[PDB]
Amino acid sequence: ELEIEWHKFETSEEIISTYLIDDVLYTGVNGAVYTFSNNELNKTGLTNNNNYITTSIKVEDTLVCGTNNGNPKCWKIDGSEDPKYRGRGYAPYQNSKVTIISHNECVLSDINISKEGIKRWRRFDGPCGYDLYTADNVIPKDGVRGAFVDKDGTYDKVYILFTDTIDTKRIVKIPYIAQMCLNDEGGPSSLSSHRWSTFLKVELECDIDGRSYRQIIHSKAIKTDNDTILYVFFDSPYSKSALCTYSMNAIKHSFSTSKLGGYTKQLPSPAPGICLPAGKVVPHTTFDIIEQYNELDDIIKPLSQPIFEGPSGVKWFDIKEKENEHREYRIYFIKENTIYSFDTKSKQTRSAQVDARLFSVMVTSKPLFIADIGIGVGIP
Amino acid sequence: ELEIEWHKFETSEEIISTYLIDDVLYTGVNGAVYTFSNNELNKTGLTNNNNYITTSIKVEDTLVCGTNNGNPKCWKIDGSEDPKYRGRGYAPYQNSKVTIISHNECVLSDINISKEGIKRWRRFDGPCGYDLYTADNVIPKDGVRGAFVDKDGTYDKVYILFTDTIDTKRIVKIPYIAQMCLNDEGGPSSLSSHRWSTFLKVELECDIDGRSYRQIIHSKAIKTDNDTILYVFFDSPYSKSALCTYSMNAIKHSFSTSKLGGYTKQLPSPAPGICLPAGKVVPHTTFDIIEQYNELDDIIKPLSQPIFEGPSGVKWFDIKEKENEHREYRIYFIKENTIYSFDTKSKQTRSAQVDARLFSVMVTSKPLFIADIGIGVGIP
Ligand SMILES: *[C@@H]1O[C@H](CO)[C@@H](O)[C@H](O)[C@H]1NC(C)=O
Ligand SMILES: *[C@@H]1O[C@H](CO)[C@@H](O)[C@H](O)[C@H]1NC(C)=O
Structure with missing residues (x-):
């Protein structure tokens, strides 16, 4: 059971991204950006040519980046212009699904950096160091x-979940x-100087009755006492x-101990x-190995439940962890029309x-x- | 729509096998064997200790083999005793699903030959030659x-369809x-003298929307003008x-041309x-290769339809091919309770x-x- 109260916009505006910045909802739509907090829906227009707002990360101010007509460009929160003129790897060249996280002041994202669109996973310039990018064909x-x-x-450490499509x-x-x-x-050489040198990957595994699932939709890592737990x-392609x-602890242990x-x-x-x-910089032998064989000979098996x-x-x-009990959650997963x-x-x-x-x-x-x-807000 | 008239037994007798021998139905049940022809259901009792009748092949007479209480033994059709005392590889040691075909006079079967039960595919003694068996772990x-x-x-040539369970x-x-x-x-050597020397195998492939099916239930090869067509x-494990x-022609061509x-x-x-x-007997080099690498580097893709x-x-x-048109069939597939x-x-x-x-x-x-x-018989 669920009763949701609706703070609706003036029109049906095609949603393009939603982010939580310090319990404030930032809904990037076509044209403006919406800002939800305290049941208050403050819309802020930026431009309307194409401008699918897609990014609302927070570095120092919560800058908001969109794609003004095939040109990606950022803004300060209130439509102001970005001092540093960020905006290349911060918003896609066309409406797409993105994955862009921001640690302290260190933006990491898979957003396309050029028009052609070779997929890579990048960390952009900032307190961590200079830009970095994964070798090609690594990210699907x-x-x-x-x-x-x-x-x-x-x-x-940064963790990313994707779904490779192997074809032999x-x-x-x-x-x-x-x-x-x-x-x-970065790596040791001059060519491999802006490439991740610590990139590794393992297969997950979600089998239930001999049916193994392999297409990731969405992930979220909850942080608990002894460790953090990753929900994928x-x-x-079937009907399920x-x-x-x-257990991120199991994953970390596997990364540190398993063999390539x-x-x-x-x-x-x-x-x-x-x-x-x-x-410190990774030596050359370690880097040659880590680039050739970047996958552990292992497979992460899920926890028992849920x-x-x-x-x-x-x-x-x-x-959303239940307020009464502890380590017992309510997982709200949403379909095109139906809440669950x-x-x-x-x-x-x-x-x-x-x-x-x-x-x-x-x-x-x-x-x-x-x-x-x-937006709607729910109470059962 | 379907109206079926029912020639039922006196009691609900657990079915264990059904065969068509020259348009006569031979239903091996626990105890007796039933014989359907001309809407005539002639039951013939053989023994009733355990005697799950499982085989009703035809070599010279349609002999019928069952498993009398952990001892496999054949009979002539009318309960008489087999002159040649066949019955080892003709019926399983316990109630199981079998696969036993009979060409002219040459029985081929996967039935267990001993009590322990290593799975193999065998041709038994007769006009083709002496017995043969596949190397171990070949048949799942x-x-x-x-x-x-x-x-x-x-x-x-003999064709067999199975489903391997690879585990790496x-x-x-x-x-x-x-x-x-x-x-x-048989092979050239003395140890490999009763082993198939011409055994090869390819993967099938039944993909529809990125969902690939991999567990064979049942097969049937219809013989048509230019070639025969294999229905699998x-x-x-999902709900489909x-x-x-x-096209058996495509399969044969692939077998003859593709590389190991x-x-x-x-x-x-x-x-x-x-x-x-x-x-002629296969040389030793050919046999070493055919036993080491017995799978073609290929994959049979299905026809367009159906x-x-x-x-x-x-x-x-x-x-059942439709009498009006041609190359247009009615495929009756049956579930535990529901005809389709x-x-x-x-x-x-x-x-x-x-x-x-x-x-x-x-x-x-x-x-x-x-x-x-x-038994029932159907008319729409
Ligand atoms: C929303 O806009 C109103 C209009 O001035 C402002 O007073 C309020 O502080 C804004 N709230 C947020 C969370 O931006
Ligand atoms: C069925 O049994 C009857 C009983 O004698 C016999 O006359 C008939 O020929 C049998 N039919 C078949 C097909 O065995």
């Missing part, structure tokens, strides 16, 4: 589906998680989708995925119909649902 | 799902078709099944899968409910459905 043309930053004890005898999709060192310095949502959970797939010899002293003390299967075609999902909630404790799924073209669910303290009608 | 523990004999222009990093099922020379003489029915069709997967060098003069003139998708859990399927027909021309699927625990559909001139209640 579909893009990076999830990205989040997590401590590795002492060094920040038949096309097989494979879900991957990939780790990189947030403060990587897989879709399938499946939420799995993985296809590489049989002894791994060098600064082990490939390992972060390095500030200013694995569950919902409909096919879910688009978003967000978690799932309680990790009772393992029952509730549903609800809503006559709108939903786009996302965000959760700050109460699930707010971003649909083309406008 | 699930068994061989379909088998039929087809000319290769001049030499008879995750478990993947792979459907395979495999060809052997019916009059193979795949199941999936798919019928595909393959993993073998990069030049194939020897008596090409591996190639039948040999009577009395590919279709029906429910998950279908158990049988049989074809599918017309290749109209591409519409009809269904029908029947309150019985169906076991199979046979088609002689009118589809007769073998359920535990008894």
Whole structure:
């Protein structure tokens, strides 16, 4: 059961992105950007030629970047101009799905940097160092589906989830998680000087009854006491989708200990995925290995629960820990027209119909649902 | 729509096998064997300790073999004793699904030959030659799902469809078709003297919308003018099944021309899968290759139509060409409780409910459905 109150726009404005910046909702739409907070929907127009606003990251001010008519360009929050004139790798050249995260002041994104569009995963210039980019064909043309930053004890690391499409005898999709060192310095050489030197990846695995799911929809890493737990949502070309959970501690341990797939010899002293003390640069042997064989000979198996299967075609999902109990969540996952909630404790799924073209669910303290009608806020 | 008239037994007798011998239905049940012809249901008791009758092949007389209490033993049709005392590889040691075909006088079967039960595909002693068996781990523990004999222009060849379960990093099922020379003489050596020397296999492929099906249920090869067409029915751990069709001419061409997967060098003069003139024996080099790399570097892609998708859990399927048109069939596929027909021309699927625990559909001139209640015969 769910009662949602609707703060709608004046018109049905095609949603293009939704972000949470310090419990303030930033809904990038065509034309303006909407700002939800305290049930207050402040719309701010920027331009309207094409200008699909897609990015609303926060570095120092929450700058907001869009694509004004095939030219990507940023702004300050209130339509003002960006001092640093950011905007190349911050917004796509055309309306697309993006993945752009911002740590302290360090923007990482998969957004296309040029017009042609070779897919790469980049960290842009800032406190971490100069720009970086993954070698080609590493990131699939579909893009990076999830990205989040997590401590590795002492060094920040960036994790990204994507779905590769291998094609040898038949096309097989494979879900991957990939780790990189947030403060990587680049490779050793001059050509490989702006390339990640700590990029590694493992296959995930979400099997239930011999049906293995392989297409990532969306991810979210909740931070708990002993470690953080990663919730992935897989879709399938069949009529099903499946939420799995993985223990980031198990993943980190696997990254640090497992062996590189296809590489049989002894791994060098600064082990490939390992972060390095500030200013250090990966040697050449380690880098040659880490670029040739960048996949561990392993497979991350999910936690025991909650694995569950919902409909096919879910688009978003967000978690909200129940205030009464603890480590028991309500996972609100959203389809084009129908809300669904799932309680990790009772393992029952509730549903609800809503006559709108939903786009996302965000959760700050109460699930707010971003649909083309406008925003809604939910109370059961 | 379908009206079926029911010739039922006196009791609900657990069906264990059904065969068509010259348009006579032979229904092996627990205890007796039933014989349907001209709407006449002649039951013939043989023994009743355990005696799950499973085989009703025809060599010279249609002998019928069962498993009398963990001892496999054959009989003549009318309960009489077998002169040659056949019965080892003709009936399983316990109730199981079997695959046993009979060409002219040459019984081929995957039935377990001993108590332990290593799965192999065997040709038994008779006009073709002495017994033969496939090397171990070639046939999956699930068994061989379909088998039929087809000319290769001049030499008879045996084709078998099974589903391998490869397990390297995750478990993947792979459907395979495999060809052997019916009059193979065995390998060259003394150890490999009763092993097939002409065994090869390719992957099939039944993909529809990026969903690839890999679990074979049942096969049937219809013989047409220019060639024969192979109808395979795949199941999936998801909620779907798919019928595909393959052109045996394409398969034969692929077997004769394609290259052995993993073998990069030049194939020897008596090409591996190639039948040999009577009395000839495969050389040693050809045999070493054919045993090491017995899979072609290829994949058989289905015909254009009819590919279709029906429910998950279908158990049988049989074809009946429409009397009016030609090359247009009615495919009756049967589920545990529900009949389904599918017309290749109209591409519409009809269904029908029947309150019985169906076991199979046979088609002689009118589809007769073998359920535990008894036999039924259908007219639309
Ligand atoms: C929304 O706009 C009104 C209009 O001035 C302003 O008073 C209010 O502070 C704004 N709130 C936010 C969260 O921007
Ligand atoms: C069925 O049994 C009857 C009983 O004698 C016999 O006359 C008839 O020929 C049998 N038919 C077949 C097909 O066995």
